[PDB]
Amino acid sequence: KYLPELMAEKDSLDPSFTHALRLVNQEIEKFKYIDVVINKNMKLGQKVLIPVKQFPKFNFVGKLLGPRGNSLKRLQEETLTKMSILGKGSMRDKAKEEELRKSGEAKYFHLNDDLHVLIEVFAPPAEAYARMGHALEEIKKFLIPD
Amino acid sequence: GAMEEKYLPELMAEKDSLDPSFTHALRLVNQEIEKFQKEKYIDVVINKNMKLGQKVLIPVKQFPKFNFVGKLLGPRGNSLKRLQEETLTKMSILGKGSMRDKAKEEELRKSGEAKYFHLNDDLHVLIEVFAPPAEAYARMGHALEEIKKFLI
RNA sequence: UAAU
RNA sequence: UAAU
């Protein structure tokens, strides 16, 4: 009974209610402890603020990515993590970025957030926490100007 | 944060202009406004102490009466004290099976019911670390390696 | 093996 | 410096 009401609203809501539509679709689409013997891969995620407020003119994203992205790819490979630069100011063109933000797609919803690096690890527990610790130490050398 | 600068006003403007016959969308917009108006992001310039906790299952079902709790603690609890000190964690044995006497162990999360609902969950070890971020993850990984030696 |  |  409840999902058919949600779908009627999805279909009848005016497009300009981008946030309501997102919350409705999200609600529609909705239709543990670590066991150390079998030691299965677990997901760890951690967001790290880029200190833009305190360094408003430093080019953190450009330093993080490098030419053609190669600096961030090499840092990903040598830390065995995935790193995503997300949040306000994470794109090159701020006017383009703002239009994507306004589109309401979940793919661009992170643009409402503060500029951060999302570090994600998938590994057995002891190794996942170790990897994340090493990634945090290396990522400092990029986020703190010198 | 950029949420309080543009997301929240936007939510607010939608809630004010939504036709209230959309009772689900209006409900969900209102709940989302509520969620935002009431921990996750590392500030790596300040690098302040951060909390990390991880619960580690004691594998009672595969090993139904190997005495894990006894091996973890040792005499007067010294072996668990060693392990916390060497890893720089706090470690708490919790779940069902945690207390020495099974009889009362049932009654304590009947009635009273303030601090003891960890006795509705499986038996497990809670590992807690408090340290700057890179060190805190490093410490948890080390405590996870060290503690395997007690769960096999 | 019974700790905080 | 613009990756995913």
Numbering used by the authors:
A (entry chain A): 4 to 34, 44 to 158
B (entry chain B): -1 to 36, 43 to 156
From the study:
T-STAR is a tissue-specific STAR protein mainly expressed in the testis and brain3426, and regulates the alternative splicing of CD44, Tra2β, Tau, VGEF and Neurexin pre-mRNAs262728. STAR proteins are defined by the presence of a highly conserved RNA-binding domain, the STAR domain, also responsible for homodimerization, and composed of a central KH (K homology) domain flanked by two highly conserved regions, QUA1 and QUA2. Here, we have determined the X-ray structures of the T-STAR KH domain in its free state, and in complex with AAAUAA; KH-QUA2 in complex with AAUAAU; QUA1-KH in complex with UAAU; and the full STAR domain in complex with AUUAAA. Taken together, our data reveal a unique mode of RNA recognition and dimerization by the STAR proteins Sam68 and T-STAR that is crucial for their function in alternative splicing.
The structures of the T-STAR QUA1-KH and STAR domains in complex with RNA show that the QUA1 and the KH domains form compact dimers, with each KH domain binding one RNA molecule, while the QUA2 domain does not adopt a fixed orientation. The QUA1 domain adopts a helix-turn-helix motif involved in homodimerization, and its fold is very similar to the structure of isolated Sam68 QUA1 reported previously (backbone root mean square deviation (RMSD) of 0.61 Å). Surprisingly, the KH domain and the C-terminal half of the QUA1-KH linker of T-STAR provide an additional dimerization interface. This novel KH/linker interface covers 1,065 Å2 per monomer, almost twice as large as the QUA1 dimerization interface, and involves mainly the C-terminal α-helix 3 of the KH domain and the C-terminal half of the QUA1-KH linker. The KH interface is stabilized by a network of hydrophobic interactions involving residues A138, Y141, M144, G145 and L148, and an intermolecular hydrogen bond between Y141 in α-helix 3 and Q58 in β-strand 1 of the KH. The C-terminal half of the QUA1-KH linker (residues 43–53) also contributes to the dimer interface with the side chain of Y45 and the backbone of I46, forming a network of hydrogen bonds with the side chain of D125 and the backbone atoms of K59 and L61. Accordingly, the structure of T-STAR STAR in complex with AUUAAA overlay very well with the structure of T-STAR QUA1-KH in complex with UAAU with a backbone RMSD of 0.9 Å for the QUA1-KH atoms. The crystal structures of T-STAR QUA1-KH and STAR domains show that the QUA1 dimer contacts only one KH domain. From our NMR and SAXS data in solution, we conclude that the contacts between the QUA1 dimer and one KH domain observed in our X-ray structures are most probably due to crystal packing.
